[PDB]
Amino acid sequence: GSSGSSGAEEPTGVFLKKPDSVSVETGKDAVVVAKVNGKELPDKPTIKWFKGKWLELGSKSGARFSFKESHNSASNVYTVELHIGKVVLGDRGYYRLEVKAKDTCDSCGFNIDVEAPR
């Protein structure tokens, strides 16, 4: 078939990809996608997922909260994705991704929504 096209100047930021707000439904599984330009960073960045207040996600390696981080050899980009299972209205709201390096420091903010049943 046929398709369109696009074009723009590379982003002047370390966060090659920002976690766009994802609207999920209660009882469903949420998933966020984000990337980080390591090259631009002096040292290995620190990926940490926070929830509204000064909370702390990913307590143990065996909870609904899953984390997928992959590092490319040629690309050199860290692709992190936050997956949440059995989402509830108590989870919906806003989040914040902290990322600090040797000297470089940057953080992005996303918002999730949990649609309730009829």
Side-chain angles (χ1 to χ4, degrees):
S2 54
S3 74
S5 280
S6 203
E9 277 307 297
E10 298 89 84
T12 319
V14 46
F15 270 51
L16 271 162
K17 210 286 181 158
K18 297 167 180 165
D20 273 288
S21 292
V22 294
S23 65
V24 320
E25 280 154 306
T26 325
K28 302 298 193 176
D29 34 280
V31 171
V32 180
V33 175
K35 293 208 199 160
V36 180
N37 200 341
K39 288 164 277 186
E40 283 299 288
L41 296 154
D43 208 72
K44 197 201 209 66
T46 299
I47 286 78
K48 297 175 294 202
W49 302 89
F50 297 110
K51 189 188 186 210
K53 78 158 72 90
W54 43 61
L55 271 160
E56 170 194 57
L57 317 164
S59 200
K60 209 76 82 278
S61 197
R64 63 174 156 176
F65 286 99
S66 275
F67 315 92
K68 292 280 284 277
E69 173 192 296
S70 180
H71 90 101
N72 276 250
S73 69
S75 308
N76 207 351
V77 53
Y78 299 73
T79 305
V80 302
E81 312 170 302
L82 167 66
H83 303 223
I84 310 160
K86 311 195 271 87
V87 284
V88 296
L89 271 274
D91 293 31
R92 90 208 208 287
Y94 155 112
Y95 296 83
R96 176 202 58 182
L97 177 71
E98 189 175 42
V99 171
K100 197 208 202 166
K102 211 71 175 88
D103 165 88
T104 302
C105 66
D106 208 83
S107 57
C108 209
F110 54 116
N111 305 238
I112 306 174
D113 210 270
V114 179
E115 288 193 277
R118 278 204 193 73

